[PDB]
Amino acid sequence: CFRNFNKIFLPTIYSIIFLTGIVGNGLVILVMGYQKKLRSMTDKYRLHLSVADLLFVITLPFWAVDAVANWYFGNFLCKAVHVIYTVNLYSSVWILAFISLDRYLAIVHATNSQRPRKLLAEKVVYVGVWIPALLLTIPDFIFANVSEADDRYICDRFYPNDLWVVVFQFQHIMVGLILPGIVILSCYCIIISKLSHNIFEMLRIDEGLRLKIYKGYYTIGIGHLLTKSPSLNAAKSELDKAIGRNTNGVITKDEAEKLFNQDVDAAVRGILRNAKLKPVYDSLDAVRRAALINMVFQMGETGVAGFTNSLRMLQQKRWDEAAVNLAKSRWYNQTPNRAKRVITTFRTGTWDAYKALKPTVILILAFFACWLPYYIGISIDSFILLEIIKCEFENTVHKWISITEALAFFHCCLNPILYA
Amino acid sequence: NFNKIFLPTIYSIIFLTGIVGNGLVILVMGYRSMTDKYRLHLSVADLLFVITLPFWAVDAVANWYFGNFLCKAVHVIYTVNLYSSVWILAFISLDRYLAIVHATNSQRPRKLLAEKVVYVGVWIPALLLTIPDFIFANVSEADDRYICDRFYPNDLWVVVFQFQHIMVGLILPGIVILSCYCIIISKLSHNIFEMLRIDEGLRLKIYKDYYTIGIGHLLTKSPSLNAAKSELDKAIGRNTNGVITKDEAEKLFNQDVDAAVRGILRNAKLKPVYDSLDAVRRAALINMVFQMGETGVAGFTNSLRMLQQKRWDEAAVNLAKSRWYNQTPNRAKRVITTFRTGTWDAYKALKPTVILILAFFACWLPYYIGISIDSFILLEIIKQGCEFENTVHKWISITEALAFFHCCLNPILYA
Numbered sequence: 123c124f125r126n127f128n129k130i131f132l133p134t135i136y137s138i139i140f141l142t143g144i145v146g147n148g149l150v151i152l153v154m155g156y157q158k159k160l161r162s163m164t165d166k167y168r169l170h171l172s173v174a175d176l177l178f179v180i181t182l183p184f185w186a187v188d189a190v191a192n193w194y195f196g197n198f199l200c201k202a203v204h205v206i207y208t209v210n211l212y213s214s215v216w217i218l219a220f221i222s223l224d225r226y227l228a229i230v231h232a233t234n235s236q237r238p239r240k241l242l243a244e245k246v247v248y249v250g251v252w253i254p255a256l257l258l259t260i261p262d263f264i265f266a267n268v269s270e271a272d273d274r275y276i277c278d279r280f281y282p283n284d285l286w287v288v289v290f291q292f293q294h295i296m297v298g299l300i301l302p303g304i305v306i307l308s309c310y311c312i313i314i315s316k317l318s319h320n321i322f323e324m325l326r327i328d329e330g331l332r333l334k335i336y337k338g339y340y341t342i343g344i345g346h347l348l349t350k351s352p353s354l355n356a357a358k359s360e361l362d363k364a365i366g367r368n369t370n371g372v373i374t375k376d377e378a379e380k381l382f383n384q385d386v387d388a389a390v391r392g393i394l395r396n397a398k399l400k401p402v403y404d405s406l407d408a409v410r411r412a413a414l415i416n417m418v419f420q421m422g423e424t425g426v427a428g429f430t431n432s433l434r435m436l437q438q439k440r441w442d443e444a445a446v447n448l449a450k451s452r453w454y455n456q457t458p459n460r461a462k463r464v465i466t467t468f469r470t471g472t473w474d475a476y477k478a479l480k481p482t483v484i485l486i487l488a489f490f491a492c493w494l495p496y497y498i499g500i501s502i503d504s505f506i507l508l509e510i511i512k513c514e515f516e517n518t519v520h521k522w523i524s525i526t527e528a529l530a531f532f533h534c535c536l537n538p539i540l541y542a
Numbered sequence: 543n544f545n546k547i548f549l550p551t552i553y554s555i556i557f558l559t560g561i562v563g564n565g566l567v568i569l570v571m572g573y574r575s576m577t578d579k580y581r582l583h584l585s586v587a588d589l590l591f592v593i594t595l596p597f598w599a600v601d602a603v604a605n606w607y608f609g610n611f612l613c614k615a616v617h618v619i620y621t622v623n624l625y626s627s628v629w630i631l632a633f634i635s636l637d638r639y640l641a642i643v644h645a646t647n648s649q650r651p652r653k654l655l656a657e658k659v660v661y662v663g664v665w666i667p668a669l670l671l672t673i674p675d676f677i678f679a680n681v682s683e684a685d686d687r688y689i690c691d692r693f694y695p696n697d698l699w700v701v702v703f704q705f706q707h708i709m710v711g712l713i714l715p716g717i718v719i720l721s722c723y724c725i726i727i728s729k730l731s732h733n734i735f736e737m738l739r740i741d742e743g744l745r746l747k748i749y750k751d752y753y754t755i756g757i758g759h760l761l762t763k764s765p766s767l768n769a770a771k772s773e774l775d776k777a778i779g780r781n782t783n784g785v786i787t788k789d790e791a792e793k794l795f796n797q798d799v800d801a802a803v804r805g806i807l808r809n810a811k812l813k814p815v816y817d818s819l820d821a822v823r824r825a826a827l828i829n830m831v832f833q834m835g836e837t838g839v840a841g842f843t844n845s846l847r848m849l850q851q852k853r854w855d856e857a858a859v860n861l862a863k864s865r866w867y868n869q870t871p872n873r874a875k876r877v878i879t880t881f882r883t884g885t886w887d888a889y890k891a892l893k894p895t896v897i898l899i900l901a902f903f904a905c906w907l908p909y910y911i912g913i914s915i916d917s918f919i920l921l922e923i924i925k926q927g928c929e930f931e932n933t934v935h936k937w938i939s940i941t942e943a944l945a946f947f948h949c950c951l952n953p954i955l956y957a
């Protein structure tokens with residue numbers, strides 16, 4: 123086979139990203155870099171991400187000049203462009219891994235374990251993400267050179283065997299996607315598990331945990347209504363029907379968690395069906411979502427849906443207005459302290475009655491979305507390389523790899539785009 | 543040629559030691575400590591591999607006689623064993639981290655991890671990684687002998703799998719093991735801070751008799767604050783002005799503990815006692831050195847005897863008879879309880895885990911040196927020619943079989 127339809131259209135893509143990326147990241151480093159005021163730890167990591175992108179976007183006119191006609195830059199700049207691309211390739215994804223780590227420490231070890239969150243943001247990021255990637259750039263400092271093949275000069279990495287190619291193109295999948303990707307997905311699974319337990323701890327304080335059958339109808343665990351029927355043996359049959367064994371009126375703390383988690387999912391599925399509740403729950407955050415779930419566990423789907431003004435105020439982020447409006451209700455004088463805690467939870471968004479993770483989820487997912495078509499492409503090239511699929515299809519796939527790598531560069535002008 | 547005599551030698555020993563060894567381990571807990579239950583998973587993994595070792599010997603001595611199907615089966619059993627063994631040890635490290643660092647926070651997810659996660663994470667992904675070996679291993683009908691091994695389409699397929707092997711087999715499990723150990727070593731070294739914090743007290747200002755900072759750290763014996771600040775400024779390098787941070791106090795405490803351990807390990811009476819003691823009981827001995835000092839603690843000749851003899855109830859009652867106990871009861875009562883129980887109750891086994899993991903990696907270490915050199919020549923960095931190239935290939939052959947002893951170090955671990 124042999125190695126240009128998208129080569130005068132492709133340089134416009136580097137230019138769009140250079141113009142958006144330089145202006146975008148430039149004003150972020152202008153705002154963040156010289157400011158002292160409102161700094162959640164993720165903003166410090168975002169500055170590291172913005173500086174990494176800014177350094178790399180400066181390299182884009184070179185990519186565009188190389189794509190249009192030639193490489194007039196020389197030996198040193200061929201190495202520099204290649205080293206700046208590698209540092210931005212590894213640091214970016216690893217900054218998101220350190221951002222995901224920060225979230226794990228913020229949700230799981232909030233008070234349980236003092237911050238190492240300060241150390242990762244102030245010092246570790248330099249020698250744990252910056253320096254390794256700055257040293258991983260060494261094979262590109264010498265193997266990347268200027269070729270004077272035809273009157274047209276080609277600047278790229280010239281290794282010696284191919285067996286040197288796959289060992290580095292595996293190092294790229296490992297350090298670039300496998301190692302940081304695991305960290306991010308681990309945090310995203312540990313959090314949602316130990317965050318849907320805070321709902322247990324919130325409702326244990328409010329509804330109460332009873333391991334034996336109590337009443338005013340027959341009840342078990344975190345307020346699980348078994349039957350309205352005036353018969354204890356009928357309550358046993360309803361208990362054994364949805365738990366497994368013939369328990370006989372007594373359950374345990376660990377197995378009580380499961381029963382409650384089933385009622386949480388049933389209420390969540392119900393909220394996602396209610397015309398009034400569905401948009402509000404989708405608008406709210408984890409803690410404020412749990413405060414609304416708490417209300418469904420007490421009033422019910424219809425009971426919550428009734429609070430027209432407050433639900434609209436919760437949907438529109440008007441916290442103090444929603445809390446004041448909710449205080450002027452039937453519920454606030456029915457259960458003064460349970461409503462006091464829930465209202466103040468809706469007011470602040472914290473567990474202070476006993477930290478936003480949502481923009482982080484968007485940032486990582488958008489980065490994953492940017493690089494996804496390139497990963498879809500690169501795999502097919504590796505599939506044809508191993509002789510799994512079969513020359514016209516080979517060079518046409520290479521074409522999409524060129525455009526997807528350039529469309530993936532949009533990840534640079536996104537961290538600044540996130541501030542909407 | 544010598545490998546026709548030396549490989550069956552290494553196979554025979556490892557077969558007998560491995561079959562009699564792992565066999566016992568299975569039948570013991572075939573009908574409960576969670577660090578053992580994984581050790582049972584290892585015996586099922588290792589015994590299956592030892593069961594295939596006569597095939598290795600027959601095919602090293604003479605011919606492959608066992609057909610195409612059994613060629614694939616030996617390749618799969620080897621692959622399963624390669625990935626399960628190392629990943630069980632990762633889960634062993636993971637369990638200890640949850641047992642030491644999250645002793646209460648994450649109480650029993652270990653009960654699930656050892657019952658459920660082990661099959662979805664160690665067994666299933668290893669048995670699904672057995673697929674390339676199931677396809678590519680076949681019997682080559684060669685001229686004078688039949689050869690059993692994997693034959694891939696191109697040299698690229700070789701690289702893809704022979705590097706995948708280093709990730710899910712060495713980099714990924716090793717990265718888990720090392721990080722777990724790094725956090726355990728940090729939590730138990732933290733834990734001693736909390737002990738002395740309850741006993742010698744923590745503060746960021748000074749006191750006198752004797753100017754002191756942090757957790758009973760004597761700045762100067764001289765009655766001059768200028769010298770107390772001068773000692774403090776130089777203790778943590780940076781300018782202090784007489785004040786330090788809680789996190790900064792740990793740095794001074796670790797310096798005080800490590801220097802005390804450097805004292806104990808350079809003392810003939812205390813070194814055999816400290817080496818024999820566990821993490822919790824080691825901290826209790828250190829606590830005593832912070833109160834009495836080397837010479838003072840080394841004086842309890844009768845007490846130090848039972849501490850290194852695993853007779854706790856005998857040592858505790860003997861120590862309550864000393865001058866030290868009645869003169870200072872509260873602290874001494876709490877330290878005696880530490881030796882007696884091995885728990886932090888006054889304020890989980892770790893050594894077999896560490897030995898098992900170090901012994902496993904030591905077993906595999908020479909093979910990794912040999913496989914490292916072979917990859918250096920294949921990639922063209924080293925150059926002596928083909929003479930040392932076969933010497934390296936002779937090394938890999940011997941070191942790979944010599945690294946099967948890993949199957950043996952689980953039942954042998956009961957010593």
Ligand SMILES: CC1(C)CN2C(CS/C(=N\C3CCCCC3)NC3CCCCC3)=CSC2=N1
Binds near residue numbers: 184185190204278
């Ligand atoms: C991975 C990589 C850095 C490698 N590469 C490549 C191959 S090198 C290269 N130019 C540049 C890539 C990035 C650094 C500067 C040279 N080739 C040609 C040169 C003539 C015009 C078309 C592209 C294209 S896009 C890309 N990205």
Ligand SMILES: CC1(C)CN2C(CS/C(=N\C3CCCCC3)NC3CCCCC3)=CSC2=N1
Binds near residue numbers: 597602616617689
């Ligand atoms: C990684 C691997 C399984 C690959 N391999 C090999 C190559 S296959 C093989 N026999 C067996 C190894 C493992 C499965 C059964 C075939 N070769 C020869 C046949 C001629 C005499 C020496 C051994 C030897 S030891 C080893 N280790």
